Amino acid sequence: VEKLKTQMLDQEELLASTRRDQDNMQAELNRLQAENDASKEEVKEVLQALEELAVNYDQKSQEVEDKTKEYELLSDELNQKSATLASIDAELQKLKEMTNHQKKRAAEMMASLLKDLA
Amino acid sequence: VEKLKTQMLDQEELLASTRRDQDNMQAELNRLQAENDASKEEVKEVLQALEELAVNYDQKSQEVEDKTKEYELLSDELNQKSATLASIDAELQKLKEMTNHQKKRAAEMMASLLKDLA
């Protein structure tokens, strides 16, 4: 009997040593699941964060498209205004020419009267 | 003659007064063209500035689209990794069950030998 109990001792101390490797593994597995489900939520958030940006940059590029037909209409108008003024410049030269012709006429009519011999 | 020259005086002083209104107008017209061609270039620039933004916000929203299939693949993978670990958790329970069955077997074989009547 005293050999058989030395056998049942070594057997227990081996099956104990096996239980403590099965716990290191159970533990390190559990931490790997923790470390994982961690990363699993960061990507959840990053995927949200990224969908906002997609919406945000999408509106912003439509606001840019609206500002552009705004400033293009204004571009058109100013160009038209450029013609109005150019036309008014033209009217303004005729008015100069008109009053010159009146200068001429008045002066000729003056000289013609100062041809009074007497 | 001395009435006719008083007439030719008043005539000149009126056609002078008319020339100086035609200059106020020529001047104020000219400034309006200046003030205009000014605005005409600001819109030129603003239209450029706006086309850059259109390009800029357009790339940025494609970079967001690329970051998203990037983080979606990663999302897929981590979910797969979640299964691997879950499977390894399962293997790890069997190994516990296996070594328990060996505990049982060894202990029964021990008791059976300690049934030595003598």
Swiss-Prot record, chains A, B:
| Deleted gene: phenotype | Mice are embryonic lethal. They show perinuclear clustering of mitochondria and impaired lysosomal dispersion.
Q: Which domain of life is it from?
A: Eukaryota
Where is this protein localized, as stated in its record? Cytoplasm, Cytoskeleton; Cytolytic granule membrane; Lysosome membrane
Q: What is known of its domains?
A: Composed of three structural domains: a large globular N-terminal domain which is responsible for the motor activity of kinesin (it hydrolyzes ATP and binds microtubule), a central alpha-helical coiled coil domain that mediates the heavy chain dimerization; and a small globular C-terminal domain which interacts with other proteins (such as the kinesin light chains), vesicles and membranous organelles.
Assigned protein family: Belongs to the TRAFAC class myosin-kinesin ATPase superfamily. Kinesin family. Kinesin subfamily.
State its role.
Microtubule-dependent motor required for normal distribution of mitochondria and lysosomes. May be involved in the mechanisms of growth arrest induced by exposure to DNA-damaging drugs or by cellular senescence. Can induce formation of neurite-like membrane protrusions in non-neuronal cells in a ZFYVE27-dependent manner. Regulates centrosome and nuclear positioning during mitotic entry. During the G2 phase of the cell cycle in a BICD2-dependent manner, antagonizes dynein function and drives the separation of nuclei and centrosomes.
Subunit note: Oligomer composed of two heavy chains and two light chains. Interacts with GRIP1 and PPP1R42. Interacts with SYBU. Interacts with JAKMIP1. Interacts with PLEKHM2. Interacts with ECPAS. Interacts with ZFYVE27. Found in a complex with OGT, RHOT1, RHOT2 and TRAK1. Interacts with APP (via cytoplasmic domain).
Q: What is this protein called?
A: Kinesin-1 heavy chain
| Species of origin | Mus musculus
